[PDB]
Amino acid sequence: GEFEKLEALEQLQSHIEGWEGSNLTDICTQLLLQGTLLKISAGNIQERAFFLFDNLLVYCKRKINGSLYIFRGRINTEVMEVENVEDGTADYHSNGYTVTNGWKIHNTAKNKWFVCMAKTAEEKQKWLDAIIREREQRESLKLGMERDAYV
Length: 151
Fold this sequence. Notes:
Helices cover 31% and strands 36% of the residues. With 151 residues, the protein is α+β, with helices and mostly antiparallel strands. The protein has a single domain, classed as PH-domain like. It has an 8-stranded mixed beta sheet. A hairpin with a 2-residue loop joins strand 2 and strand 3.
């Protein structure tokens, strides 16, 4: 059940070297989606492993040693905005490269942007659907709590 998923979070995290910040078992309960995406940011174009948990987005560099990943960054999804990018778009946000099957993520706490690109339209849709689901579940929990605190 829930305890088993907490142990699974601890194990998952054990495959990530150089973790920064609070532990997954303190702030997450589930993994909605993981996968490799091309990440384009001000000074880098590289593939990253992305993990979307309830409340958190993590991205890593792909690396008996259990390390598979090297920590690169995390975003509290409460301060994450996402914006679609239409195919064929090329501008400074993608460092002039043509984006297809891509979208933008805004870390509003650090005011940092980056572009994510999947390899296929179906993969992009899986990511957008998961981002929507993570936000909807989180908002539902929050509004339920506030409603019970209010009435």
